[PDB]
């Protein structure tokens, strides 16, 4: 009941409920030893939507993300987007010439260059299963 209703308030843009259920269920947070969420998850209260928008949209104007994050200011919304790309939350870029915030490029060389860098571990893990099988085989 605390944690399911916690992420209930996180997904919506409501902070008054977020502060209410902190006050309601803080003593349960005392038993779990997790006081520190209130100081470090209020960061992601504003950063969850900008992760959600930049995954949905592809080439957005900063004048429209202000009302969509209900921040009512385009001038600091540059800085929230600047902090998220600084933290590597979204890989996107900003056009600071006429107000464009565009996302990344298309699906990349993922079909060509990547998959052997997953395949090397799976060779090495499965033959070690074959090695650990054969070495521990014959006790009689």
């Amino acid at each position: 009941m605390p944690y399911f209703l916690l992420t209930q308030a996180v997904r919506t843009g409501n902070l008054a409920k977020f502060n209410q259920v902190l006050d309601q269920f803080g003593e349960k947070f005392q038993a779990d030893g997790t006081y520190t969420l209130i100081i470090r998850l209020r960061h992601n209260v504003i950063k969850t939507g900008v992760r959600m928008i930049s995954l949905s949209y592809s080439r957005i104007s900063l004048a429209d993300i202000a009302q969509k994050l209900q921040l009512d200011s385009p001038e600091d919304a540059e800085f929230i987007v600047a902090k998220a790309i600084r933290d590597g939350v979204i890989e996107a870029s900003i056009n600071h010439e006429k107000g464009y915030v565009q996302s990344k490029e298309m699906i990349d060389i993922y079909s060509t260059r990547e998959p052997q860098l997953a395949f090397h571990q799976r060779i090495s893990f499965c033959l070690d299963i074959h090695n650990m099988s054969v070495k521990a085989m014959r006790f009689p």
Binding site: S111, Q116, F119, R122, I123
Partner: protein, 65 residues
Amino acid sequence: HGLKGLNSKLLDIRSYLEKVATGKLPINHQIIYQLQDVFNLLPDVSLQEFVKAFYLKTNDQMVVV
């Protein structure tokens, strides 16, 4: 040892044009470099389409893994 002959034929063609660029023996104008003039144009390594040879490398890898 297939590649140990690749430098062995290379060290022989190394020694020949050292002693004819030096200029000891007369330059065979007919075949000794005119056939090499044909040779020295075709190690084509043009990248950005031959880079896309390597999902077939992933394909040859995929059956192994």
